[PDB]
Structure 1
Amino acid sequence: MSNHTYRVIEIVGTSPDGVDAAIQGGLARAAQTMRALDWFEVQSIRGHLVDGAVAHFQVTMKVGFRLEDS
């Protein structure tokens, strides 16, 4: 690596099934329309409540991928 640049994106996964589901969900959505993802760093784990249960988990994470062509 001497000329390998990365782009760091921010997404917020959500799911009623917990942190891992949320992380997993958000990530599939990125890789979906984005080029080979490489890593993710969680920024925060939030949430909304209804009856008094976690309506949905919100896991903000930073996602990195490589840029290439030429």
Structure 2
Amino acid sequence: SNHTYRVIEIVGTSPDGVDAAIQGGLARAAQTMRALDWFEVQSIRGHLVDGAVAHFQVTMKVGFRLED
């Protein structure tokens, strides 16, 4: 058949960098979403506290296949 996908936007966070934030966001998404297929980073930001990075914040679009 011709599949249809849905694309949602999430932000993963971690003090431990860009990869960790990506992985953390996607891990949360996978808990309650099915048929995840791809992601696309929209932005990399972070929150600073006392001059240090408290959290990296990576905004992602996440695409998944819609069930019939």
TM-score (norm 1): 0.92
CA distance in 1, matches of 2:67, 2:15: 36
CA-to-partner distance for each residue in 1:20-44, whole Å, 9 max, x for gaps? 0000000000011001210000000
CA-to-partner distance for each residue in 1:35-66, whole Å, 9 max, x for gaps? 12100000000001112111100000000000
% identity of equivalent residues = 100
Unaligned stretches of 5+ in structure 1? Answer: none
Aligned residues: 68
CA distance in 2, matches of 1:56, 1:40: 20
CA distance in 2, matches of 1:68, 1:4: 9
CA distance in 2, matches of 1:53, 1:60: 20
- 2:60 alignment partner in structure 1: 61
Give the structure with the higher percent strand: 2
RMSD: 0.9
Q: Is the partner of 1:17 in helix, strand or coil?
A: coil
Q: How far 1:68 moved relative to its partner? A: 1.8
TM-score (norm 2): 0.95
